[PDB]
Each structure stands twice: as structure tokens, then as C-alpha cells.
Subunit: 226 residues, 2 copies
């Protein structure tokens, strides 16, 4: 059975995780884990309560690891236990993946050094200090690393992983079973397509978070430099 | 505060719910409820454990009600307590909505009689016996009813509801904040675009479920005929 694991942490953006979870859980001969320091309740940034299924120490060797993003990424970038777990699993995983600001956690763990990667548009400047080659594309692959932008990045890249772990017909069948054919009613999902006034509002609302994450990123980079 | 409620039931397809939940929970001055017979754990069809936040009796009057789909829809179509709750809330709600097979629950409650509606492609033949005018479109509006197809239907229609409850700029800001710009790597999300061999596989895998739901639908229709 293919072993797939998601890191589940306080203040996660839950859709970053629950999207790919439902897609990948639809495949035959997979087992999906929700990993934290101990099994039990973990609260997402919206207040939704989720349950972790396994601890770091009890998690099996993973074939796929996925790091979601969210407010809670800042704490995780300086959590030595979580970073060590990610490094251990990444060493043998077939696919190391992240959604949105989850790539900043991979960066803090040292897994983006010399690698092409993306992250959420408002935090993209934090990739270079973590050693990455920043790329402004929605899905960026470098070897076995796959970083994706947008809250539903993991739904799309889960179909790619299905095709590569199984075959294209299996990925197509899952897409059809889920009737997955998005059609957003607005075209404002990128700073290059949204109205300038909307981009300003969004940047202003992210400014305090970006400031705090600049500080965290520099401390994380100092640890990598040692 | 706008009151938004999702029905959370055993064997729900969790993404049908968790997608619109994270979008709508991002708006100012909303309160989101996860409703079942009592607060506490409810297990989705994938095994993911979610928590209901309120009972039927304690739920406030809702401005928006959303019925997700999933395996568990069959039981809900013959649950008199759940159907009565849906009818009570629909009477005063500004928006009555569903995702995927959630529209079959609205049908069992009598809320599709004479109304245009859609549902998941494999179960579309069950709409007419519930009194609906079946429509093969991804999002179908009829008055204050909004039925949508696909596991992520509620992400897209949540942006529509944001624009109508607030304004277009608010919907665009949320889309940008979430960097929501899907791009599926395959084009098999409709029986009209998927390869014929894939459609056959998917129809065969749904056949036992469709048979059981034909029986349930006829009993539900008999109750409406009384
Ligand atoms: Cl997206
Ligand atoms: Cl969809």
C-alpha cells in the first residue's frame, strides 16, 4: 500500500490539506495519515477541528509527504521536532510536496537549497533567503520536489501523482468520479489578473504577517548557515 | 453576522463541505456552523473525522444552508428529523444550496418540486422522480436555490455568494488571498469529455449504489406524494 502523509498543525489552512486528502483517499491501495506530535484534535485557522491519526514517532516510512500552509507556518518554521521529522521522511520519500506557504516549512528544513520552488504570492520574497531559486509558476517541479500555489493546488497535483503512481486512466477515473471541472466566477486569483485596487487591499492585509515572517525566515536561515 | 450552516453527516464526502467552509469562513462578519443531531465527532467517507458544532435544536436561523453529498446521502434521504430541519431552515434562508448528491437530499425534503436542479452525473436520473426539472449544467439557479456539480462546486459558488452578500470586490479579494486559480492536469471531469473507456469504468463502479438509491428515491417520492 502506498503511504501518504500530511502534516497537520495548529492554525493550518485546512483546505490546503483536505482537498488532496479526499482525492488521494479515493485511490486503491493507499493509506493516508494525518501527522502531528500525538494523535488527537488539531484546530485549523478557521476553527474547524481535525484529528491527527499518528505521531511523528509512530508514522511509517512515507512514499508521499505533503506540507500544507496556513497561519501556523510561522511556528512550524522554528519547531525543531517537526523540521527533523520532515527531513527524515524526505530522505526516502518518492514525492516531497507542499501547498501555498507550506513551502516555507520545506525551506526552513533546508530542503529548498538550490531548488526551484514557489509559494503564496504575498510571501514569495522569503524563498531566496532559504536558498531556493524562486519561480513564479503555479506548480514547480525539481526532481522529486513539487511545490504548488493556491489553496487547491493539492487537488490538481494529486491527479498528477495518481497518474505517476498508478496510470493516466486511474487519474482520469478519479477526476470523473469526483466530477472535478472547476470554473471560478471571477478571475482574481493572481496578482497579475486581479484589479490593482484588490491587490492593494490584499497586500495591506498581509503586511503584518509578512513582517513577522521576515524575522522568522532570517532566524531559520541562520540555522541553515550553521 | 451572516449565519451559514453546513449539514455534517456520517459518510459525507468531506471536500464537498470543507471547500466552501474555508472560503466562506474567510469573510468578515460571518459565523459558520457544522450541524448534526448533536455536537461531536462525525466520520466522513474517507475516514477523516470532523466535529459538528451544533445540534438541530440549537442551530440559529440560517441565512445560507448548504447540503454536501457523499455515500451517506442515502440514509439522509429517509431521515425524518434531518429532512424536517432542512425544510424549516429553507423556509426563511436567503440561499438554499447543495453540492453533488446533496441535491438528492433537497429532493427528498420536497424542495425541488417544480425547480430546475442538477446533481452528480451518475445519479442524474433520480432528479425527475423527486419532482425536479433536470438540468445538465454545473451550477443551476432557480430563485434562491443553487445546486452545483463537482466535488469543488461549493468553492466556486461560495465566491458568487460572497459577491451577492457583500460585493464583487470582496469576492475578488478572497479569491486573491487564497490564490485560487485551478488548472486540472486532465480533462476528464465530465462524461462528455472523459474517454469512453473511463466513463464505462466509472459507471460500472457506481452501479450498485445507483441501484440502491433508485429504491430509496422511490420511497422518498411516495412520501412526497402523500
Ligand atoms: Cl488554486
Ligand atoms: Cl468541481
Amino acid at each position: 500500500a502506498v503511504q501518504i502523509g500530511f502534516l497537520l498543525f495548529p492554525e493550518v489552512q485546512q483546505l490546503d490539506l483536505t482537498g488532496p486528502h479526499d482525492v488521494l483517499a479515493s485511490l486503491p491501495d493507499v493509506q493516508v495519515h494525518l501527522i502531528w506530535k500525538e494523535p488527537g484534535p488539531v484546530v485549523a485557522s478557521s476553527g474547524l477541528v481535525l484529528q491527527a491519526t499518528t505521531s511523528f514517532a509512530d508514522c511509517p516510512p512515507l512514499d508521499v509527504i505533503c506540507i500544507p500552509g496556513g497561519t501556523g507556518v510561522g511556528a512550524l518554521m522554528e519547531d525543531p521536532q517537526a523540521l527533523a521529522f520532515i527531513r527524515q521522511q524526505a530522505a526516502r520519500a518518492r514525492y516531497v510536496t507542499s501547498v501555498c506557504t507550506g513551502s516555507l516549512v520545506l525551506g526552513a528544513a533546508g530542503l529548498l537549497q538550490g531548488k526551484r520552488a514557489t509559494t503564496h504570492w504575498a510571501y514569495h520574497e522569503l524563498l531566496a533567503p532559504l536558498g531556493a531559486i524562486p519561480v513564479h509558476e503555479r506548480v514547480v517541479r525539481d526532481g522529486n520536489l513539487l511545490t504548488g500555489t493556491g489553496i487547491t493546488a493539492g487537488i490538481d497535483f494529486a491527479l498528477t501523482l495518481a497518474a505517476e503512481l498508478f496510470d493516466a486512466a486511474t487519474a482520469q477515473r478519479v477526476q470523473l468520479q469526483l466530477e472535478y471541472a472547476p470554473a471560478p466566477p471571477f478571475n482574481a486569483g493572481s496578482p497579475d489578473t486581479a484589479p490593482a485596487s484588490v491587490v492593494q487591499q490584499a497586500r495591506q492585509r498581509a503586511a503584518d504577517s509578512l513582517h513577522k515572517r521576515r524575522e522568522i525566515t532570517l532566524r531559520a536561515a541562520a540555522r541553515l548557515a550553521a
